[PDB]
């Protein structure tokens, strides 16, 4: 299904993982596969398909706010689409070469593991 | 004259001379730069903001890798430098994902666009 937030964040469950999938909660280290796109033109700026999974501690601001919120509650094998407003990404200013000012971002994220 | 080395292995080379009285990147000032970043061992460019909005940071507070805090210091607007940055002054043993492996030397070309205060 779909959840929207008043700030414009959209979190869509694309597919469910197996029933026994470990759950991602704040403070857990998680491993994910992702494809990241600029929402304005569908240009893919990064993916780790065919690469080592991306590991981070959920809920500590290591990653953009849209990920901390959007990955929370995933179970192993779940895939979500996150449609992230600038305020939950890199803001008005944008970021480096990769992210223009005022960028809406779309990520497809698959939860690979959770360290309980 | 136009190359300086540091005991940690950093090399700072002046590529281009900007404005003679151009505002100077001094510690504690917010500075705006254009850059190209390359993995030295295979010459793979991992990022650049050339032709895009400049990158702003506060110099000398550890918000960026050590090689930048040291290497950008003293630039004047319009200057360009090449930084040859050892792992200890970059991403060290951990690296930065697959694009920047453990124990990687980095090279950056950096151009100073502006200094605020
Ligand atoms: C080469 O590839 C990059 C990732 C690239 C950069 C460019 C962007 C387009 C992108 O392609 O990822 C991208 O797809 C993206 O936007 N990502 C990556 C996947 C998670 C979501 C998002 C993100 O938040 O990235 C992150 C985004 C760019 C920066 C953060 C945004 C939120 C903000 O609160 C944070 O403040 C801290 C900074 C990058 C990361 O996920 C990496 C892992 C983490 C950090 C750098 C910070 O958390 C830092 O905080 C001190 C740390 O704790 C780290 C471990 C310290 C060590 C030395 C540095 C490691 C650096 C690794 C860098 C990696 C693999
Ligand atoms: C999307 O693009 C990324 C930049 C990418 C990430 C991946 C690397 C390959 C790279 O492509 O840049 C790259 O070319 C690179 O290596 N850079 C960027 C240009 C400066 C030199 C170097 C660097 O130090 O990056 C930095 C490197 C990855 C991490 C730092 C390395 C030194 C270490 O001491 C720091 O510990 C603290 C962490 C990223 C940055 O320059 C950004 C600005 C700074 C931070 C995230 C931290 O300082 C953080 O700590 C709380 C902050 O104080 C910030 C301001 C808080 C706000 C909310 C977050 C802003 C996030 C911006 C993210 C940006 C533009």
């Amino acid at each position: 299904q779909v959840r929207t937030y008043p700030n414009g964040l959209i979190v869509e469950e694309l597919s469910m993982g197996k029933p026994n999938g470990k759950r991602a909660d704040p403070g857990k280290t998680v491993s994910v596969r992702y494809i990241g796109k600029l929402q304005k033109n569908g240009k893919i700026f990064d993916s780790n398909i065919g690469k080592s999974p991306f590991k981070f501690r959920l809920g500590i601001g290591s990653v953009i706010k849209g990920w901390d919120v959007g990955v929370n509650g995933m179970r192993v094998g779940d895939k979500r689409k996150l449609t992230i407003p600038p305020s939950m990404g890199y803001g008005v200013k944008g970021a480096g070469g990769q992210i223009p000012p005022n960028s809406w971002l779309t990520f497809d994220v698959e939860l690979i593991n959770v360290q309980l």
Side-chain angles (χ1 to χ4, degrees), chain A residues 34 36 45-47 54-56 60-65 67 89-90 95 98-99 105 107:
Chain A
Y34 68 93
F45 54 80
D46 196 15
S47 87
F54 175 81
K55 298 192 192 167
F56 73 106
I60 69 162
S62 294
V63 296
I64 57 177
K65 291 172 188 173
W67 271 57
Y90 297 99
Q98 292 311 305
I99 308 292
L105 307 173
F107 290 83

Side-chain angles (χ1 to χ4, degrees), chain A residues 9-24:
Chain A
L9 179 66
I10 309 165
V11 181
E12 300 173 48
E13 297 189 75
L14 302 170
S15 48
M16 293 304 105
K18 296 317 168 157
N20 75 348
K22 290 183 289 190
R23 191 188 61 236

Side-chain angles (χ1 to χ4, degrees), chain A residues 22-26 28 30 58 71-76 111 114:
Chain A
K22 290 183 289 190
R23 191 188 61 236
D25 301 321
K28 298 294 198 299
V30 303
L58 181 63
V71 174
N72 186 21
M74 285 181 84
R75 289 170 179 81
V76 169
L111 187 59
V114 177

